[PDB]
């Protein structure tokens, strides 16, 4: 009863339970290994890197 809760998002269109983004320091990729190569396909907008 003294620990904080993680945010909840669940709907037919989108959710936040199929992945884990991590903490502020110890971050991690929300998407898993098989769809990390296709991250562009899970986005409404994409602003690529500068190289």
């Amino acid at each position: 009863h003294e620990q904080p809760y993680r945010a909840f998002s669940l709907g037919f269109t989108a959710n936040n339970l199929s992945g884990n983004w991590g903490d502020y320091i110890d971050r991690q990729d929300n998407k898993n290994a098989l769809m990390r190569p296709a991250r562009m396909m899970f986005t409404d907008v994409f602003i690529p890197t500068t190289k």
Binding site: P37, P48, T49, K51
Partner: protein, 54 residues
């Protein structure tokens, strides 16, 4: 920590840059006349190179 690295730079094709490959390119394949030339030289007893001599 070098093998199996992640994609660091983007891959792209600039607009209207040419590709020079037709639609039958996957069925295309290479060829060298060197093997046939070697067979013919061996069969016709043509001048050999000195690399045959150790």
């Amino acid at each position: 920590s070098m093998d199996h690295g992640m994609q660091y730079s983007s891959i792209y094709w600039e607009t209207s840059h040419r590709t020079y490959l037709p639609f039958w390119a996957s069925l295309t394949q290479k060829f060298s006349w060197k093997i046939m030339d070697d067979q013919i030289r061996s069969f016709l007893r043509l001048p050999k190179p000195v690399t045959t001599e150790p």
